[PDB]
């Protein structure tokens, strides 16, 4: 359910959010860690989601991990920076949910349940399975199958989710995508 915020034609100071949190990871693909903050571009997109810091390996530019295929992805062509950080908990503004959840399996199960072809989400799109899934997964490896009507397209549409659980403190994942523009680079930091 990665919350998505898009910022257009606005000057900024990304440090204000980072200083409030305690950052543990800042990987910038195809760009320098501060190059995105130092140089200014057409638009900036920021995503925030309940993602465990512990699955650091699962979040990667290229990985065979479940999130890449189903939970979340970033455009390869555009430079992408991912921030793994932690709220101090001094602020009471952000409260905590039950437990972290991720989609381990999203696939085109056939009307037979023999041959299976996986459904891989592209960048910038919510998975088709997430519409069937709710907000949190109650039990480990919960699988949801929705009866499909001919108008829907028929066949079997299935979804699955897996338990992660959460520590006292909150671990969050941030996805940043930066777009260059011909002249409209107006989103910027005697």
């Amino acid at each position, epitope marked *: 359910n990665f919350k998505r915020l898009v910022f257009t034609n606005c000057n900024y100071n990304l*440090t204000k959010l*980072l200083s409030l949190f305690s*950052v543990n990871d800042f990987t910038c693909s195809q760009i*320098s*860690p*501060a190059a995105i903050a130092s140089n200014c571009y057409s638009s900036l997109i920021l995503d925030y989601f309940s993602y465990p810091l512990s699955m650091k390996s699962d979040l990667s530019v290229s990985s065979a991990g479940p999130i890449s295929q189903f939970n979340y992805k970033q455009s390869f062509s555009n430079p992408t920076c991912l921030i*793994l950080a932690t709220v101090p908990h001094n602020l009471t503004t952000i409260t905590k949910p039950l437990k972290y959840s991720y989609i381990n399996k999203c696939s085109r199960l056939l009307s037979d349940d023999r041959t299976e072809v996986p459904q891989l989400v592209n960048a910038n799109q919510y998975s088709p399975c997430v519409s069937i899934v709710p907000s949190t997964v109650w039990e480990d490896g919960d699988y949801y199958r929705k009866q499909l009507s001919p108008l829907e397209g028929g066949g079997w549409l299935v979804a699955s989710g897996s338990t992660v659980a959460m520590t006292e403190q909150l671990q969050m994942g941030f996805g940043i995508t930066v777009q260059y523009g011909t002249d409209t680079n107006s989103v910027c930091p005697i």
Partner: antibody
Amino acid sequence: EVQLVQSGAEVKKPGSSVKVSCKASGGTFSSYAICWVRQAPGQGLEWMGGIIPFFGTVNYAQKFQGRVTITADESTSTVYMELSSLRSEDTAVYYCANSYCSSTNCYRYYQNGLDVWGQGTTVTVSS
Amino acid sequence: AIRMTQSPVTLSASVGDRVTITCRASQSISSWLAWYQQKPGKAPKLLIYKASTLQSGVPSRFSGSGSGTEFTLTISSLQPDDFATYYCQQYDNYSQLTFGPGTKLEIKR
């Protein structure tokens, strides 16, 4: 060629407050990350407090958590480590190290190499 | 959650003798464990970074190899300048850079 200069040796009292300044040059101020470590005399090295100056984000060791506050001024390129409730155990030498500067060939803000070190300050605690 | 155990301290190696030191992480850092050489009474010096590559200007073919929790540091030829206290740093997920206890290196006689 990053350059680090640290304050002179300071003698203070337990329950006082200590402010040590780490000054840097020879590398982009926004790109470097300053990490504060304490070496107890005749003891294993320990790390207390890691701060990125431009982001201003601060992470502290669990043992020293809530006892050390680090503030960095980008304009003066000075990083200040503040410790209160001084104890006999605190007496030691303090080293600040700037990770390899990015803007060209890095993407974990540390990655290649990381740490250059400084002259260090010997803080002595006397009641 | 993170703790470091180093090779037995005070390894006994004479000059020209291979030195092997191994520090084990509590969990699977996998790709991040720099090796630091500390001269007594002075500032530390960088050695092998990520335990995969030598820092520019480090001679003597300092060799670091391994994966996950296990990491190793081998010096094929020992020199008087080489003898120093050696530490290892765990980085990435920078919630707590935990320096290793360290191993002293001394001439054997």
